[PDB]
Structure formats: C-alpha cells, structure tokens
Amino acid sequence: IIGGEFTTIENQPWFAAIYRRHVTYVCGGSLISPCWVISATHCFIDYPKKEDYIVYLGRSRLNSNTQGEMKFEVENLILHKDYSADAHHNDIALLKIRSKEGRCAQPSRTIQTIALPSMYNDPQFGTSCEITGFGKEQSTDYLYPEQLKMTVVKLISHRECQQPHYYGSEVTTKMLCAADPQWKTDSCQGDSGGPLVCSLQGRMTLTGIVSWGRGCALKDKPGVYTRVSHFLPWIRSHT
Numbered sequence: 001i002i003g004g005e006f007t008t009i010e011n012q013p014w015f016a017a018i019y020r021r022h023v024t025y026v027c028g029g030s031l032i033s034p035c036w037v038i039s040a041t042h043c044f045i046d047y048p049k050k051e052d053y054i055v056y057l058g059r060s061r062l063n064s065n066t067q068g069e070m071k072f073e074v075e076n077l078i079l080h081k082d083y084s085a086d087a088h089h090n091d092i093a094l095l096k097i098r099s100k101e102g103r104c105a106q107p108s109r110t111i112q113t114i115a116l117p118s119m120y121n122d123p124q125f126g127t128s129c130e131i132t133g134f135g136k137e138q139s140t141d142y143l144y145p146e147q148l149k150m151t152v153v154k155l156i157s158h159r160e161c162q163q164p165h166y167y168g169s170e171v172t173t174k175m176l177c178a179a180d181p182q183w184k185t186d187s188c189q190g191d192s193g194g195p196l197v198c199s200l201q202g203r204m205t206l207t208g209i210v211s212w213g214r215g216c217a218l219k220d221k222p223g224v225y226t227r228v229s230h231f232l233p234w235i236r237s238h239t
C-alpha cells in the first residue's frame, strides 16, 4: 500500500495473510465464510500445490504472531479455470481453510467475515472504498511493511479506465479501476488478493480483489481489481 495509514486487524477482521513454505509472504485475501478465504489466482498460478501454503486470520504484522491469530492449512486451492495474464483476467481464487485440529475459523474481535456484493451491483464511480495489505509502501522499496496498512481510493468508470492514456482495452467489464485523485495513494506489489471494500447500502461489501496495475501510484495508471459481483455464480458453486 502506497501512502495511506497503518492499522490493525480489528479494522479489517476479514483480511487474511497467505504465505508459502519454500516461509514467505504471498498475498492477502478475504474471509467470506468460516471455511473459505477468497483471493487472486495469479498469486498461486506458479505454485498450485495447496500443501505449501499457510493462512492466518486476525494477524496485524507480517513476521510476528499477532495475539489471537488463527493458522490454517489449505484443504483446497481453487483457481479460476478461465484465468489468463498479460492485465490478468478472471484473477480470482478460493482457498478452503482448515487448521491442524481440522477446524475452520471462529469469529472474534479480530476475525470476522466480509459480505459479498449482490449480482452486478457496484457503487457509482467516484465512491470512496478502502484497500488493505502488507504490500510495498514505495515502488522502489525492497521490503514489505511489518505493520498492516490501508488507504482510500475512488472507483473509476470503465469508460474512463478504458481510455488509451489509461489502460485502454486491458481492462474488461469484469474489472474495476480505483485510484487517488492525486494518484498519491494506491495498492502495490504484495497487496494482490487483498480486499477492495466499499459501503453499499450501509453494508461493508467485498467489491474487489487487488489484481494488477501498471506500477504503483502513477498518474493515469489506476489499480485494477477483480469485479466480485461478476463472479458470484463461480463463487457459490465452488464453495
């Protein structure tokens, strides 16, 4: 996350930190139900083996065990069959979580689920949503922040993101663009699979999943996100 502010897991009780054994940080995710964390397929396409991943819930730091956190193995890693990169397409994945004691996640003050959107129901452009992650704080940074971060970004119309000086055609209607009016804050390397949460009808909804973007916080190059209300049939069936 470029710019923005620091936060703890209580301000995003649904944020999941995903890691890979041969143990490093992989991507963020979102808990949509006790046994399912939703994320981005490009995060796992290179190491499809569910056995190498570890998922945490209620964790606010990248390399320190946050009090009250739950650790989970991936009982199942489901990647979207129609995925394709180069501007990732259908960048969505589902991870079924299960602890060593074979249990899923149990809600607490630091672990809650996030609601999915109603079909094809997205806030109007210009709406302010938030993004969470352990991503880089600066494009030239080598390290990832140790503390979780979040920032605000405004939804951009498909017509506006469609423009050439923007992302041209790389962006599809199954995608949502979001960015800062001054391009001073945005998601970056390490924030993928993370949630784009917007308030829809007075309800916090998982509107988008960090997917891709040209660099970070650069003019006319918004962050692109997998449009969740366009993959509900895929989510319900697969869960």
Ligand SMILES: NCc1ccc(C(=O)O)cc1
Pocket: 186, 187, 188, 189, 190, 191, 192, 210, 211, 212, 213, 214, 215, 216, 217, 222, 223, 224
């Ligand atoms: N602004 C979206 C975005 C998400 C992820 C990356 C990246 O992993 O390198 C870059 C940009």
